[PDB]
Every structure is written in structure tokens, then in C-alpha cells.
Amino acid sequence: FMLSQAMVEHLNEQINLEFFSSNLYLQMSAWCEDKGFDGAAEFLRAHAVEEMQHMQRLFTYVSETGALPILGAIAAPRHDFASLGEVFRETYQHEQKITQQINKLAHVAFTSQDYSTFNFLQWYVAEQHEEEKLFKGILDKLELVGEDGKALFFIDKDLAALAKK
Amino acid sequence: MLSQAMVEHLNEQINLEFFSSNLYLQMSAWCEDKGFDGAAEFLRAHAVEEMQHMQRLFTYVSETGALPILGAIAAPRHDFASLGEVFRETYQHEQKITQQINKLAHVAFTSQDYSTFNFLQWYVAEQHEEEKLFKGILDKLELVGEDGKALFFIDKDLAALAKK
């Protein structure tokens, strides 16, 4: 009753998206590991964990309103990538998609006067702000040093450091 | 290292473990929705542990030099007729996992993949624990029955079980 039926559906859709996102990042981390980029792998693995916490936070919110969060089938994430650079370009694009989705979600909550859900989404709005700075910076590195083996060797070390942080 | 067949089997188990976690998570939501917070807390913790079983296997495959593949995770059922059905289903599900681990252990052995056989022993031990735990819950339902007051007390026990 606290959530409109249409809002429960939007939130459930975001829950499934976040879940898939976590799995994509995890699958990507396995690619990096496979290709000898352990720093990238550690970074993406931690990022997958955090995305799973985003999904969990939504799942919990939905239940707390008295509605029923519902996981559907999670699609199989892509597992073959061309290069480390492509992995992080795909991640950046994917994060932009997430930001766009969270923003649409906020707009819907607002235009329907669901101030509670609007209030709830502020955490995500803020969190996606941090994400884009982080992932753009990685692309800026690749742009700066290039994508030859030596460049990737050093970038991989910076990713290892970002993970521990 | 790992045979291609072994990699496929391990990836299938990684996928099942992921599904299992999602099943327990979905179940915890039904429990909470119906007011069984103890059950919901217990199931949530189990969904976390199952996700760690998933990760451990994922990491093992990677460490052998193979590429683990998550695949598509099936949708878990999201409705149950009663709290009893929830835990009858968890029990049957855990037996399935135990059976699947055993087959895997068998495939590892019969192909002389002793490293994988050794790895799988942690899971073999864990499932022994899992089965005692869930059988004990069914035993409770059987004992007190499944009326409202019964479930009320069983739910309290579940909340206690969750805290550890």
C-alpha cells in the first residue's frame, strides 16, 4: 500500500538490473584474471560485490514497504572481451546506463509524489556520482599511457591499488 | 590442467550455487512478507553463505587457469503456500546440492583429478552439516504442527538459529 503497484514494478526492474550488473562485473573480473591482469580482476571483483550491495539495499527497501521484491532470471553476462581497454570502456558505458536508470527512477518517484521512494533513491543518486568520476579516470589513464603491454602493466597496478582503497 | 569436461561440470555447479543463493533470498522475502521475520533472517544468512560457496568455486576454477562462466541464473520461485512448504522445499533443495557435490567428487576421482577431488571435500563436509540443520527444521514442524501458534514459535527458533 505504501508503494504504488507501478513503483514496485520499477523497483523490481532496477533490482534485476543491479543483479545482472554485479554478474557482468564478476564475469569481467574473471576475464582480466584469465588474461593476467590481477589488479583489474581484484578491482572488478570488488566492484561486483558493491553492486550486489546496491541491489540488496533496493531489495530490502521494497520488502520494508510491505511489497514483495522479485528476482527474475539473471541473463548470462558476456564473457569474451577483446582487450582490457574494452573491458573498462564497457564498464564505463554500463555505469552510465545505471545512472540514467536511477535518474528515471527518481523522476518517477517524484512525479508520482512517492517522496519516501524519492528520499530513498538519493543514496543511489549520490553513489552513481562517485562511480562516473572513478571509471572516467580509468579511461583517462588508458588514454594517457596507451594500451601497449607496458602501459597495461602499469595500469593494472593502479587498479590493484584502487581495489585496496 | 582441468579437463574441458571438468570445467563444464564446475561451471554448472557455480551456476547452481548462484541459483541456490537466489532461491534462499527470494524465500526470505516471502517469509518477511508473511510476517515470519525469524525465518526471513535465517534464510537471508543462508543466501549469503551459499553465495560464498559460489565464490569459492568460481575462484578455484580461475586459479587452475580455466575460465569460470556464470551463465544465466534461473528465476527462483517467489510464492509458497505456507511456511512449511518453504522449509520442505529448502530440505529437498539441499539434498539435491549434496547429490550434485557427490557426483562431482565422483567425476573428479574417476578422472584422477585429485586436486579437484581434494577441493571438493570442503563442500562434502558442509553438506553433511546442511542436511542435519534442515532436517531438524522439518522435525520441528512435524512435532508442533503448522497452525498459527506453532509457526509463531518455530519462527522464534529460526531467528535464534540465524544468530550464529
Added chain:
Amino acid sequence: MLSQAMVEHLNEQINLEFFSSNLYLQMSAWCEDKGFDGAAEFLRAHAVEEMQHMQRLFTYVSETGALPILGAIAAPRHDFASLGEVFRETYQHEQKITQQINKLAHVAFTSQDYSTFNFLQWYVAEQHEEEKLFKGILDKLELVGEDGKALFFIDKDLAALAK
């Protein structure tokens, strides 16, 4: 500066919160009278909590430069049929408060009073918590029933919730 109308909206909410507090205090006394000390304890603490919601708004209004005004507070109902009714009434009441909070929020936004909208966010969040809490109690009544033994055990859960 708060609009003349917004001051009136806030002042009315101050009055509603005050009455809400007294309603819960009166209910706690019914509970204690009928031997439900767990329930009395819980509602007693809830009445205090609500008095704090009142105070927070009162202070906000004062700090904007406006004058909060406590009107007259109606007498709360003191006659209830059963413990179940007490908690159904409370859940219903909490839903009314939630709705009033949402209206205030909407009027603040509509007014481009971003300050008051911001301020009300604490309340929006609190009400999310409150409804989960009270629906949980109705669920327990539903599960266990409303016979004597049932109420006996629910009252225990209420005392624990109180702590």
C-alpha cells in the same frame, strides 16, 4: 521566510503530532488496565517518540522566525474493545500521519520551499520505519489469533520491542 500558509500547515501538523502522542499515551493506559504491560510499555515509549516528532517541528518553525502555536488538543479515545483494536487503530493512525507528512512535503515542494522540503525528509524516512513496525504487529495478531494465550505471547514481543 515561511509562507503564511506553510506556517499554518506546520502548526496544524504540530497539533496532530501532539494529539497522536496523547492518543498513544491513553492507549498505553488501556493496555496496562487490561494487564498488557508489554503493550503499555511499547505504546508509552511510542508516545514519547511522537512527542519528540512534535518538538522537532515546533523548533523548526521557531528557528525560521515564525511562531509555532499549540492549539487545543482534543481528548483521545480511552475506550477500546480489545488489544487487537488498539493496534489496528494505531496502524490506521500511523497511516494518517504518513499521509499528512506527504501532503506537507508536497505543499513545500510546490511552494518551492526547498528548505522545508529538506526538513521534512527526516519525517518521510521515519514514517517508512513506523509502518513496517506497526504492520509487523498486525501480522503477529493475524498469525497467532486473539485468544488469551495468543495475547499473552504477543504482549511479551511488545515489551521486547519496547527495549
Added chain:
Amino acid sequence: MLSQAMVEHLNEQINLEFFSSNLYLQMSAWCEDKGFDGAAEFLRAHAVEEMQHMQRLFTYVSETGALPILGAIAAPRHDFASLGEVFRETYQHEQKITQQINKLAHVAFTSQDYSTFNFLQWYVAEQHEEEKLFKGILDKLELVGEDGKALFFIDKDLAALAK
């Protein structure tokens, strides 16, 4: 679920372990009776250890859902010729236990009962330890002989081993 046959194998081992414990306790009493307190202490602790091996198996069987069954326990020998014989009998007995454990392990594996195989690994390891321990005592008897002064010093080593 443990096979009907595996339950019987485990139950029989439970019984063997129980008797083994009693055998060592009875031997400890012979030792104390003959003035070998070191040896009595050592065997007494060994009887407790063996009772624990028993309990571990008993609990395993119960936890699988099956029913462990303590049968009747035969009376252990209480008449021994000498301290040397006591410890030769124990070494021989430990070898029998080791062999039974290995058979159980083999039956578990053969059955594709990977759970019980896994469980038995603790026992396989323990028996490795035990045989080194008991062979060490026979070696000492061999080295020193079995005259009174000899036994006097060996008994001291046994008390120390007990700690």
C-alpha cells in the same frame, strides 16, 4: 543417506571402539595393581581418548539421520603376564583398529559414500599417530629389557607420555 550396510559397519566400529576403550582401562588397572603407575596413567588416558573416538563416530551416525546402536560389550582380558605383554597386546590391538578403519574407508569409497570417506579421514590420520606412539614403546622395551630396573625406567617414560 547412509546405506543400511554402512550403518551396520559404523555401528560395529562403534562397538569395537567401546571395547577397545574398556580393554585399555582394564589394562591400566593391571598396571596399577603391579605398581606401574606411569603405565596405568598412560593407558587410562588412552582409554579416555578411545572413548572419544567412539563418541565421534556415534555422533556422526546420529547426524546422518541413522540410529547408532551400542551392542553388548564383551569383558576385556584382565589377566596379563607382564608389562611387556600388556604393551605388545596394545600395539597388536591398535593395528587391528587401524585395519578396521582402513576397511571402513574402503567400503565408504567403494560405495561412493564420499561423505563418510571424508569423515573417516580424521581416523586414518589418528591411527598413523597411534602406531608410531605404540611402536616407540615396544622399541624401548626391546632396548632396555624387562628386568625390574628396566621396567622402573620405562614406567617413568610412560607417565611423562601421559602428560
Added chain:
Amino acid sequence: MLSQAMVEHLNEQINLEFFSSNLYLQMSAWCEDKGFDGAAEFLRAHAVEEMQHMQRLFTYVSETGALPILGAIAAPRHDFASLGEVFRETYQHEQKITQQINKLAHVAFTSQDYSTFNFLQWYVAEQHEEEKLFKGILDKLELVGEDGKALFFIDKDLAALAK
């Protein structure tokens, strides 16, 4: 020096205590098999306690200079009708042990074996404790009944008693 007859009395009690321990262990397994983990835990600890009573007597006999003798231990009953029967059997059994202890005490006194009489005083005291404990459990069964919900709550009390 213990009389030939007193050694036999003590040895027989050693055997009874051993069987008593095994009886309680077997019962604990029935309990766990039927889903009464509280009861299993309680009886399991009680079996250990009884094994200690056994050991204490065993040691006493040895320390007098006599030879304790573990005879054969019969198989305990493993088939019970219900939790209630398990605990009625235990209370009955404890009463038998109490009576045997009293007979031993009387034979010791009659023999002017003041040493053994003195020794048995620990047991006389323990049995006083034990009977209060076990009668308390029968009283609870009487109060609550033996339906499923009843047993559910009694099992909780047993687990607590175990701690």
C-alpha cells in the same frame, strides 16, 4: 584391606554404573532420532556424568590395592515408545541406582568398613540431587502433557538443564 565380598559388591556397582551410562547414551540417540535435541543433549551429558561415577569407584577399588574388574556390559534398550517413556525409565533407573548405593553403604557399615562407607558418602549425596532432578522432569511431563507442542517446550527446558 577390602573384604573379598566388598570387592565383588564394588565391582558389580562398577558394572551397573557402566551399563547405566550406556543406557543414557542409547536413550540420547533415540531422542536425537525423534528430533528431541534438548533431551538428547541432556541425556548425553548425563551419560558422561555416569561414566564419571563409574571411574571414581574404579579408582577407589584400585587405590585400596584390590583389582577392579569390568565385566561384560549388556546392550541397552534402544527402542522406546515416546519421550515420556524415556524419562520415566530414567527416573526408575535412577531409583534403582540409589537403592544399590544404599545397599553398598549398608554392607560397608555392617562390615565395619568405615573407609568404604566414608567413600560412598559422595554417592549418597549425588543420588539425592539426581532424584530431585529427574522427578522434576516427570512433574513437567505431568503438567504439560505429551502432545507435540508440549514435548516441544519440554525439550527446550531439557537443553537448558543440559547447560
Added chain:
Amino acid sequence: FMLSQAMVEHLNEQINLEFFSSNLYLQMSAWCEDKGFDGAAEFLRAHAVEEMQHMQRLFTYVSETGALPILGAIAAPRHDFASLGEVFRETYQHEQKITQQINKLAHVAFTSQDYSTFNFLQWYVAEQHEEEKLFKGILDKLELVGEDGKALFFIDKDLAALAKK
């Protein structure tokens, strides 16, 4: 009596192999040091020490069964290598040989129903799992950054770090 005579022989053979392996790694470390790769040297030196502990653990196990472990003559390890990369390629190959030997050992223990020795070898089975990930990662580094002087300079620093770990 606990070990079959054939098993004592297999275990003694593994003991001599482990000993030679330790010495090979030690000799390799001296080559790295000689060629100015102190990080590699520190790494290989520590690896030689650990292999000596593997051998020691087997030696002790054999004695504990009541059999007699026997060291034969240890062959002279190769001391002339072409490059750092060859050193680590040889190490990786050698580690694969060790893994294969441990596996054959496990199979023999099993097929002869020596569950005690089978149980004992599980430690080695697990340990060799770790080894191959470690040494493959080193080859992946060489593959990534190349084998020019600058590349080896940076790889040598990573090996120094792996050693302290």
C-alpha cells in the same frame, strides 16, 4: 609394515626429487643474483627453502610410518641459463613435473588402498595447485611487458615483492 615396500620406494623417489628441485631453485637464484636480478634471486631462494620443507615433510612422514627414508645422491642442477625468462620458463615446467609426480603418487596410494598415505599427500596436492597459478602469473608478466632490459627491471621488482609475501 604400515607402508608397502613399493610405497616406501615411491616416497623415497619423491623425497630425492624434491631435494634436487630445491637445489635447482637455489642454483637458479645464484644465476639471477649473478646477472643482477636480486628480486628474482630473493624469490627463487625462498622457493628453494619451501621446496626443502616439502621434502622434509615427506622424509618425516616416511619415518613416522616405521619405514626408513633414504636420500641418494643429489644430481648437480644446471647452472648456466640463457635469460631470466628461460629461468622462469624452466621453473614453470619443473613445477608441472612435480605436480604430475605428486598426482601419480596419490593415484598409487589410492589404488593400493593406502588411505593414510593418500590422506597425507592431500597437502601436496593442494600446495602444487597454488604453485602453478604463481608461476604461470610470472610467465604472463614476461609475456605482457616483454624481455627487454626495462621490462626485466620492473619484473624483477615484482619478484622482490612476491618474496616478502
Added chain:
Amino acid sequence: MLSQAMVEHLNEQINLEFFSSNLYLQMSAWCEDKGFDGAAEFLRAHAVEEMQHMQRLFTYVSETGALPILGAIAAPRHDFASLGEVFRETYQHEQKITQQINKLAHVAFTSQDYSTFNFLQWYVAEQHEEEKLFKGILDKLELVGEDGKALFFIDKDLAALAKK
């Protein structure tokens, strides 16, 4: 730096030290096999220390810029007629080492390799200790003889000696 001749001599000593460690290790196994655990513990510790003497020398050669070369390590004998023979052999072996260190010290001096002469002083001091220790063990055997009870007590002393 080091003359080629000096490098050869040092490498030969590295090889002897490795062998020595293996001899004591092999001996410790015979001791344990015959039930002399004290002797086996004492000899095991000595095998560890000898392996450190090896390493110290290995590191010195490397540090001078030369390449130390391990060579093939001879097989140590693995059987002995009695515990007494074990320790008569250890004594003779230690004297050989002492003699070899002295020759080395002499070669260092006579070629004015003062750095190597200085390095070798640690070994010169250590062998003085070694000889007191092992001579003292023979003195024990001589004193109590080599019957079973004698060896039993000597073995206890050896276990004590090992603990430090």
C-alpha cells in the same frame, strides 16, 4: 675479486657442507628407526645448522661477484651397526670439516685474500665448539658403555642437548 682457485675451493666447501647436513639428516633417520629419538632430535638440529653453514658460504661467494656452484651431493650412508658407530662417525666427520676449514683459511692467507680469511674465522670458531661437543658424546659412550640401558640414558642426554 676472488681468484678462480679460491672460488673452486669455496664451492668444494659449499658442497661438503651440503653433504654434511645430509649425512646428519640420514643419521637422524637411522636413529629414529632404531628408537633413539633423543639422538634423532639432536642429529636433526645439527643437520639444520650445517645447512645454515652451507648457506652462509653460498651467500659469501655470490656477494663477491663469483658464481657459487652446488655440484652433485654424495649419498650419505644410511645404515650403522650401532648408536655408538653413529657418533664415532660424526666425530671423525667433524674433524674432517675442521681440517678442511683450516686448509681453506690457509689458502686464503697464503694468497693474501684477507677478505676470505676474515670470512672463514666464523667457521674456525664454530668448529672449536663442534669438536668439544662430539668428543663429549664419545666420552659418554666410553664411560657408560654401549649396552641397551647405557644407550637408553645416553639417548636421554642427547634429547636434552638438542633442546638449545
